Design a binder for these strands. Structure first.
Length: 279
DNA sequence: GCGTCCCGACGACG
DNA sequence: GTCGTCGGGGACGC
């Protein structure tokens, strides 16, 4: 491919009722926080000036977090989570402008809380949850575990949503439909697009329930991806997958202004995604 | 430098 | 068009 390029439409900062947006969440799988910062990733984040920033795959210890993270005047409330043992693997973080009411780590399950994958920041009008969903790996070695994770996750998210509107962002590790990736046929047996994962995503949307912010607004918009393998000039050709989302409770739709995909932002095999809400 | 963890390009085919 | 097979980018802890 290549010619079937994608140009993400301008930012729409107005709710369906006309109310101007008041919240701007940005999520980004950085593929190594340290490496990302060296690649001018934070510089891009200052330009976006989000209210909240959620990062996945930081692969960094809190002892080793760069000093540049204390030069973000608009995101002074910083929260991190890393695996209990696997140093430099996985890793998630959330940076907020305002102080969250409450902040939690994990999904309350001893079994799925060892790889630094989830952070929960509760605000007044809603609950934010950023995540880095387990990769089923090459040879699908971890597909059995992934399904167990998928169950625990939706059960946990359903619980949150029951007490307050929910927003889940980050790398959910699945291209839901065929429209979510460049090659549906040739990646049917690959991690990220196996039937078990796609079904796990579908059950998630219906169980909680949750709505795919981007797809909700752009039902038929194709060629919109968030990940491109570093191999074979895939990005330059736009042969990627849509693995990063912003899922919201249905009751947040009337508050949805836009869901953007920042295709031009570099620094990782994933690009950032941004959400706008008139809250 | 290695071990490890996060898939598009293509002959082969009929 | 679909089915294997192969060559194959980057960040990190050791």
């Amino acid at each position: 491919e290549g010619p079937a390029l994608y140009e993400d439409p301008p930012d729409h900062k107005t709710s369906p009722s006309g109310k101007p947006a008041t919240l701007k969440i940005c999520s980004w799988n950085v593929d190594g926080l340290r490496a990302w910062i060296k690649k001018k990733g934070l510089d891009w984040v200052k330009e976006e000036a989000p209210d909240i920033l959620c990062l996945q795959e930081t692969k960094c210890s809190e002892n080793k977090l760069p000093a540049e993270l204390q030069e973000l005047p608009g995101l002074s409330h910083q929260y991190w989570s890393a695996p209990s043992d696997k140093e430099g693997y996985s890793g998630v973080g959330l940076l907020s402008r305002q102080c969250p009411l409450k902040v939690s780590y994990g999904i309350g399950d001893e079994e799925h809380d060892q790889e630094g994958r989830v952070i929960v920041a509760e605000f007044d009008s809603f609950v934010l949850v950023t995540a880095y969903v387990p990769n089923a790996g090459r040879g699908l070695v971890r597909l059995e575990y992934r399904q167990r994770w998928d169950e625990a996750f939706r059960k946990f998210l359903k619980g949150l949503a029951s007490r307050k509107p929910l927003v889940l962002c980050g790398d959910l590790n699945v291209a839901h439909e065929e429209i979510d990736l460049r090659n549906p046929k040739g990646n049917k047996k690959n991690a990220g697009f196996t039937p078990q994962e796609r079904q796990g995503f579908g059950e998630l949307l219906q169980a909680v329930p949750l709505a795919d912010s981007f797809r909700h607004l752009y039902p038929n918009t194709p060629y919109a991806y968030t990940f491109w393998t570093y191999m074979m000039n895939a990005r330059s050709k736009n042969v990627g997958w849509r693995l990063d989302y912003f899922l919201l409770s249905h009751s947040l739709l009337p508050a949805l202004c836009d869901s953007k995909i920042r295709s031009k932002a570099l620094g990782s095999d994933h690009c950032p995604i941004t959400l706008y809400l008139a809250l």
